[PDB]
Design a protein around this ligand. Structure first.
Ligand SMILES: [Mg+2]
Ligand SMILES: [Mg+2]
Ligand SMILES: [Mg+2]
Ligand SMILES: [Mg+2]
Ligand SMILES: [Mg+2]
Ligand SMILES: [Mg+2]
Ligand SMILES: [Mg+2]
Ligand SMILES: [Mg+2]
Ligand SMILES: [Mg+2]
Ligand SMILES: [Mg+2]
Ligand SMILES: [Mg+2]
Ligand SMILES: [Mg+2]
Ligand SMILES: [Zn+2]
Lengths: 116, 86, 97, 45, 136, 23, 107, 96, 122
RNA sequence: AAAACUCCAGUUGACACAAAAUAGACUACGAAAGUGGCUUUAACAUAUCUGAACACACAAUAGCUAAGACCCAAACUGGGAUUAGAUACCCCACUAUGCUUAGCCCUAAACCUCAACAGUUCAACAAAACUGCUCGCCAGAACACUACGAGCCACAGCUUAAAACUCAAA
């Protein structure tokens, strides 16, 4: 249920102070905002941590901690492939709902009418 | 401080999924608006700005809920073109 | 000669009363992939998904039974002066005959 | 009706002559104001 | 079957963790500030068992306010709790800094077992006025 | 609207408060 | 000042009053009641003492007696609660409103 | 003329929707019902969009909750664990 | 008017509990009250540690005193309860069953605001 | 980052004269200012309307006088950063001040810049266009929230409020 707009704005005839002060006229646009990007991640940090622990506990010798090293490299490879998969996934289809461009096509077929 | 020490905001881990438990904890705090309260009460917000913010958020809620009623009301007509060549 | 007031009073869309939850027979008149474009009388057509059970007994001309939730399906939004009609009614397909 | 309803009720009021017996009766009794509502508007005592 | 809600101290509770009920499992407290994360392990009767933090583990100034620093501090605190004999732990976090889950992960990597997560972050019901907003 | 008239009156007021302090 | 042992207006016409127990007399008296009820009685007593037909409640004289009771109440308040500026406005507005009705009856 | 319509107040008019507590007496001693309209983990009073109470009832439940918690009847920061078992009437969903 | 006294008393035994209930009710009638009823909501754990009269209380016995008192007696009753060291928390309210319940026709639906902006092109 | 603190930090327990999460997606009360923790008492003018800038009563914040309170915040000030400088923005510390009581001072972009009462359905932007009636105000820019006079518990104050010179625009 949408919050009401009955006596919330500063209008003629309203006996009240304005509840809301909208900086833009509260009318639905024919547009939907574009999809925001994802942000910084800092991936592979935990494995990098486990790798660098071995190094300082073992005079910085790789042959000492091959398994931790391999964990860091495989986390890096999986992170890169996750990046590629996620890029192609967000290009392919938005999860659950529809793409902003196609929703804008829909809103262009049934436009808002603030006039008469 | 004067309540019972381990009931409030307490989630239990299941099987060993601590990640399915912290995410849950952050979700109750987000859903009850605790997290945004902490972020907003790190620095004092002067009451003029309190009113301006809490009016912009309410106008945003009204507008967002209206485009959502419109997007759902018209997602039925996103069916294939019934008369392709007009 | 019957007057339009008589035509209306004794008519079946004026004896139906409130359309919600009233069972109505309709005829498929167009099919796109699996969207069956049916009628039921009324000003608008309803569009229903193809029921996968018996999913070949739904062709152009088949008489089906519908629940009916609405007859026009419209709504006014934030800045609108008029309603946003979808030019389609709303019904749930129960089955055939 | 209000006056007559109040008349019948004053006979059961705590006085100086009723105090210890009524205190002990209260100490043996228990009233529960707790009740829960359902999704349907029905009380589940 | 499973409950997110914890056991009420005064009641029957079939859930156990190596003999101990819910109320005698030791408690790890993680204060997660914007510049530091401090983890202290105490017993159920408040006997200190382990205390580690980013400044303790070596990160000096602004590198303290990182997830890796809280992970290292959690590993060290879990190590000292293991030498004091602690396996199971109930985690209480106070704050919203970078290293909250990082300190939790540091404790699990160090080898302690988390059974409950509590959040005691201070929220006044409008008490003391905070600092002025920065003109950053 | 801009605040240019307000700016002129603001600068007028500042110079006055400085004269009363100075004299 | 009506005595604390007086009886509420709504209840002062109930046929069984002198036989009721003293606890019931105390319970519907003015001791165990509020100040707004003393003012109803002071407005009907003053009513019986001044006006012709105390059953109009729509006349100039009746309206002056009603405003005059609020003015004593606004005055009695402003004597304990001295810094109550809101009720000081009501009193001074009401002293002014009595004075107006008074004039129109004088004329 | 006989089949022309006639002025009447709307039949098929559904009776107005009523609130879960419409006609019941909210009391501050009823910490079993007040607890239902609070949050299990934080004790946060729920809004209208979760409770589904009318304005009169959201006001009476809020005032009774505040009265009981300052009077020593209700916990402030949690829902008394004894009541995390009663009939749920609130439209909220924490677990997944 | 009619008042209700919500009284959280100390966790005690029967003779001391009868003694303090007697003390409070005699204080009421000495202040000029006609007491209606005594109720025992019962002894339970407190929602929080109420510290009163140099003690830290964890449990308490909940009682109700329904009474009538003059308008100028509630303050003296509050002072007496504040000085009683067996009372954990006493609070006097106007009795709820003196406010009459209004009939609710139901939830009157609210529409979408209209004529909030002009019909210019814009 | 430095300076600062290490009479420090974490858990726990005692503990306010400060401030009032959530509710609040509610739109209420008040003349305006303003009012959102709980309880109680008192209490929210006018059975036409308009009307005091010759009156009376109020009026956020800041400020003054006197006596108290002290968690936190913080003009000023000092220290540390920055910079060409940095009397700033960033960090740390601390005061006047914010609180209470008593008295002043009487100002705000005190603006929803949209007067009260009664009624109706197009310059541009903005919050569609008007009718009756009444009061208040306004008449190129700047000089000018200024000078002078008067009044005022105000004495670096407030209200009221010009003119000369200049311009052909604002
Ligand atoms: Mg604007
Ligand atoms: Mg240093
Ligand atoms: Mg205070
Ligand atoms: Mg007038
Ligand atoms: Mg005036
Ligand atoms: Mg300070
Ligand atoms: Mg100070
Ligand atoms: Mg002032
Ligand atoms: Mg103006
Ligand atoms: Mg006027
Ligand atoms: Mg000025
Ligand atoms: Mg001047
Ligand atoms: Zn209702």
């Amino acid at each position: 249920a949408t919050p009401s707009l009955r006596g919330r704005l500063a209008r003629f005839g309203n006996p009240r102070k304005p509840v809301l002060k909208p900086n833009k006229p509260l009318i639905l646009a024919n547009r939907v905002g574009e999809r925001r990007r994802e942000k910084g991640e800092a991936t592979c940090i935990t494995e990098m941590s486990v790798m660098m622990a071995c190094w300082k506990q073992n005079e910085f010798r790789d042959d000492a901690c091959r398994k931790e090293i391999q964990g860091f490299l495989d986390c890096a490879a999986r992170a890169q492939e996750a990046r590629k998969m996620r890029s192609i996934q967000e290009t392919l289809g938005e999860s659950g709902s529809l793409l902003p461009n196609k929703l804008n096509k829909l809103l262009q077929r049934f436009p808002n009418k603030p006039y008469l | 401080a004067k309540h019972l020490k381990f009931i409030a905001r307490t989630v239990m881990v299941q099987e060993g999924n601590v990640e399915s438990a912290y995410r849950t904890l952050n979700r109750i705090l987000t859903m009850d608006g605790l997290i945004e309260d902490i972020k907003h009460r790190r620095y004092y917000e002067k009451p003029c700005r309190r009113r301006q913010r809490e009016s912009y958020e309410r106008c945003r809620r009204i507008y967002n809920m209206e485009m959502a009623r419109k997007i759902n009301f018209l997602m039925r007509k996103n069916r294939a073109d019934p008369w392709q060549g007009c | 000669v019957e007057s339009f007031a008589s035509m209306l009073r004794h008519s079946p869309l004026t004896q139906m009363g409130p359309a919600k939850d009233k069972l109505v027979i309709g005829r498929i008149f167009h099919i796109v992939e699996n969207d069956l474009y049916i009628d039921f009388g009324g000003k608008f057509h309803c569009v229903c998904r193809r029921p996968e059970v018996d999913g070949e007994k739904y062709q152009k001309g088949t008489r089906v039974r519908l629940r009916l939730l609405d007859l026009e399906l419209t709504s006014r939004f934030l800045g609108a002066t008029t309603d946003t009609t979808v030019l389609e009614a709303n019904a749930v397909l129960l089955g055939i005959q | 009706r209000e006056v007559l309803q109040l008349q019948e009720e004053v006979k059961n009021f705590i006085t100086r002559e009723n105090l210890e017996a009524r205190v002990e009766a209260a100490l043996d009794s228990r009233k529960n104001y707790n009740w829960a509502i359902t999704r349907e508007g029905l009380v589940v005592r | 079957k499973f409950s997110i809600y914890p056991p009420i101290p005064g009641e029957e509770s079939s859930l156990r963790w190596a003999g101990k009920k819910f109320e005698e499992i030791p408690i790890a407290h993680i204060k997660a500030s914007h510049n530091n994360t401090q983890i202290q392990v105490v017993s159920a009767s408040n006997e200190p068992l382990a205390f580690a933090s980013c400044g303790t583990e070596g990160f000096r100034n602004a590198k303290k306010g990182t997830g890796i620093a809280a992970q290292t501090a959690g590993i060290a605190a879990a190590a000292r709790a293991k030498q004091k004999g602690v396996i199971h732990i109930r985690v209480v976090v106070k704050g919203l800094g970078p290293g909250r889950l990082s300190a939790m992960h540091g404790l699990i990597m160090g080898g302690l077992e988390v059974i409950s997560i509590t959040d005691n972050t201070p929220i006044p019901h409008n008490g003391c006025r905070p600092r002025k907003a920065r003109k950053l | 609207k801009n605040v240019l008239k307000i700016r002129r009156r603001k600068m007028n007021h500042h110079k006055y408060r400085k004269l009363v302090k100075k004299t | 000042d009506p005595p604390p042992s007086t009886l509420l207006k709504d209840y002062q016409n109930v046929p069984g009053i002198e036989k009721v127990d003293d606890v019931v007399k105390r319970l519907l008296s003015l001791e165990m009641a509020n100040k707004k009820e003393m003012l109803k009685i002071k407005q009907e007593q003053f009513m019986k003492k001044i006006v012709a037909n105390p059953e109009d409640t729509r006349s100039l004289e009746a309206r002056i007696i009603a405003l005059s009771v609020k003015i004593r109440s606004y005055e009695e308040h402003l004597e304990k609660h001295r810094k109550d500026k809101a009720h000081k406005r009501y009193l001074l507005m009401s002293i002014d409103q009595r004075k107006k009705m008074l004039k129109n009856l004088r004329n | 003329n006989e089949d022309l319509p006639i002025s009447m107040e709307n039949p098929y008019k559904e009776p107005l929707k009523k609130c879960i507590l419409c006609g019941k007496h909210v009391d501050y001693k009823n910490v079993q019902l007040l607890s239902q309209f609070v949050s299990p983990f934080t004790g946060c009073i729920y809004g209208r969009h979760i409770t589904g109470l009318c304005g009169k009832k959201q006001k009476e439940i809020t005032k009774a909750i505040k009265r009981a918690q300052i009077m020593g009847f209700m916990p402030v920061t949690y829902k008394d664990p004894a009541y995390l078992k009663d009939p749920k009437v609130c439209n909220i969903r924490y677990r997944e | 008017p009619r008042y209700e006294l919500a009284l959280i008393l100390k966790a005690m035994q029967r003779p001391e509990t009868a003694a303090t209930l007697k003390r409070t009710i005699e204080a009421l009638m000495d202040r000029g009250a006609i007491v209606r009823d005594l109720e025992n909501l019962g002894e339970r754990a407190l929602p929080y540690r109420i510290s009163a009269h140099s003690q830290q209380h964890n449990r308490g016995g909940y009682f109700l005193v329904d009474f009538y008192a003059p308008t100028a007696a509630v303050e003296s009753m509050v002072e007496h309860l504040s000085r009683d060291i067996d009372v954990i928390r006493g609070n006097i309210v106007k009795h709820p069953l003196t406010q009459e319940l209004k009939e609710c026709e139901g939830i009157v639906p609210v529409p979408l605001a209209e004529k909030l902006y002009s019909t210019k092109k814009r």
